[model samples]
Target: ELIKENMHMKLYMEGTVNNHHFKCTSEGEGKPYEGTQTMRIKVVEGGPLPFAFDILATSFSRTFINHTQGIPDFFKQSFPEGFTWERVTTYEDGGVLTATQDTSLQDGCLIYNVKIRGVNFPSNGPVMQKKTLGWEANTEMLYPADGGLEGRSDMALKLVGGGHLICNFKTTYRSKKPAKNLKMPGVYYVDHRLERIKEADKETYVEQHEVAVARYCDLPSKL
Candidate 1:
């Protein structure tokens, strides 16, 4: 059997100039950009054993993956260097394990720890990872309870092929608060395709104060 769940996300940011006003533009070396992104819940896999197993390992690579195959950075934003896949501690029961990436934005970038939870699948279903992903980035990161323009994106993918997948989706954005402050723009739907490997430890940690925090670890309660 297959397990299904949606990944929910919300990002709020404001750029400042000279410490006073909010700057709608950034001079980052990579192309400049902004907006929101969302992905649907697809595959959910339970371990091969009755005992849960944490994804024991994880990593990341600079190679731009083809998760929607050459889908052009849908939200158009420069994700800083130092992105990596990592393994963290987790809990599992009855052969079911659940991992989650509960992250927050720092300075102005969003950071997330990968979460993986495995549970029983239907007798007729296959094993896989079920997840939801979303991103919101833009120069003008604010929407007055009701004002301005915004961009956005959404997708639903199923990891039916090991870790590879084909995603079905819709792209839409507007220039109003709820919609204006949306997350994607300049487009019609684009179909992409690809295969991705599930490496337990294949990424370089972006050292913030430590070797990128692992998921499931306790934070310094008072930061």
Candidate 2:
């Protein structure tokens, strides 16, 4: 709620990982299974917004997971030591902040600096737009695998009561086997929103909120 210290923002995010709806991995059929992650956040200082607006990702988007796909040659023995599968293709320029926060954030929605535990992924993807007033908040990471599959998203921003900023984000992944994946537990909720797009020939804004609705459950679930 502050963000005033070299305050800057320019973030974009994209994700994909549907175990069912078809296309699975190996570069998901030559790419485009949805992948986009860009960041340019400034505010290097301290807490709550004294100067801490972050978002760094120039690579690895579309649901984050590019470490080279299906490996088996010992596949690093499962995971947990820095986990490796090539670290998902370890191509870096900036691709794995996945979340950071402070303010001035708006690109495709991704302003997280932690949170995003489990039970419903970083608060189930934005706690229903957090109150929606131009919506600004980030920090995300929801993956075990991205099961079921059917991840489709769209978010936009233009405000001033205009008609260019649109929104719509869908991420569904049910598990049943076939490479199971679903991690969502920690990271509480904090009202959320991310869906902006600037246009010239085909601007796309999707990340609808302001209707308030991000309570997928596990509220107490026997902590």
Candidate 3:
């Protein structure tokens, strides 16, 4: 019957979807060792029509490489000078490969992420680039620091264009637990967040996070 340290965190999201205001918050605290988890949903902004369920939560870490490399200055909160960020993941068991070759530019809040379909393996490198299929989605009101965006999409084929849907999503960080090394402030706390839109008539979202001293991997532990 005792507790030495309180390792905890929470996830939350607040944005506008389908012309309605919506918000969602998660458990105020959780023990990271046990893989603390939670789920929350509610009708925060609409009535019977034009309603949207704003989804928010997470459980995975995705790897992405900026094609053009530049040092990231966290102190200035400035991302690299480069514009392209690519993410490629695969399922070895099913032989499924996916790639995202995207370019983010700001022309009155315009950002397009080019997603490529079908890929080839190279004798020289991983996932040798191929252009079998693709399309890029557009962004509006995209802020660089927080990585938030009001995004929508359209296609020339026009069969399932998502132009009619409107989504506003942003990431917010929470800093509570102090780091083992004060100089390495980014080492502790400061959780990440993302939100998704739900069915046509439901306006709700979710939440998630990571907290504690021993659970998360840091530089000292690796050495």
Candidate 4:
């Protein structure tokens, strides 16, 4: 019973990406930087491969805490009372949890979409993360296509209080492997970039975000 035996897990993600435009005001247009996320997940038994979970606790560091000054008048125009940069939501059934961050500008917007759901294995299947994982390498890429990866992403934002922000990021996977140290068995290193778009009407420009390194090792281990 890998699911029942390993019900508790800790996830730590640290990488560098363009800081949210709203927070990048001080840096002017923003620059690539680092960020970290910590989450605790537990499987609550329900569905099949598409399972559900309970997030006991989750938090973020670096990006949302301290940032450039002048809480954009637009942001003030929206929140009025100034809202917390982060929000955590758990499903009513306590089967799922999502963490989000708002980083919008006067013109464009960016929101981090990080979610974790439950999953199950065939009992004798691959045992990475003891059958429970926030993300798995065996799965396919988020955005897949031929000719070196390609896809489309839609973006939107509603500036008023509790405004809405939506973006569909489409890209392809470029690299996959174990870390250089190569000490662990299931740990992996992954790298991908935004696909080039040729449509003149929808010009796309995306710089290289930091490569993503991944693995499923002992829980409570360093990220």
The TM-score leader among the candidates is 3
Residue 38, model 3, lDDT: 30
In order, candidate lDDTs are 0.22, 0.22, 0.25, 0.22
lDDT of 1 by residue, 142-188 (tens): 11122221212222223334332221111111121233233433322
Tell me the TM-score of each prediction against the true structure. Answer: 0.24, 0.21, 0.26, 0.18
lDDT, model 4, position 180:
34
What is the descending TM-score order?
Answer: 3, 1, 2, 4
Error of 1 at 89 (Å): 27
Sorted on lDDT, highest at the top, how do the candidates line up? 3, 2, 1, 4
Which lDDT tens digits does candidate 3 get at residues 2-36? 11122222323344322334344333333322323
TM-score-best of 1 and 4: 1
Instruction: Please tell me which model should have the higher TM-score, number 2 or number 4.
Output: 2
lDDT of 4 by residue, 1-223 (tens): 1111111112222211111111111111112221112222222222121211102122211122111222211121222122223222322222222233333222132222223222221233222112222211121122222312232323232223333323223322221121231121121222222211111211111111111222222259565
Which 10 consecutive positions of candidate 1 have the poorest summed lDDT? Answer: 205-214
Between prediction 1 and prediction 3, the one with superior lDDT is 3
C-alpha RMSD of each candidate structure in angstroms: 19.3, 18.3, 17.0, 22.0
List the candidate 1 regions with Cα displacement exceeding 4 Å: 1-104, 113-121, 128-187, 198-223
Candidate 3 accuracy as TM-score: 0.26
- Distance from true position, residue 43, model 3, in Å? 2.7
Of models 3 and 4, which has the larger TM-score? 3
Clashes of each: 35, 39, 9, 2
Name the top lDDT candidate: 3
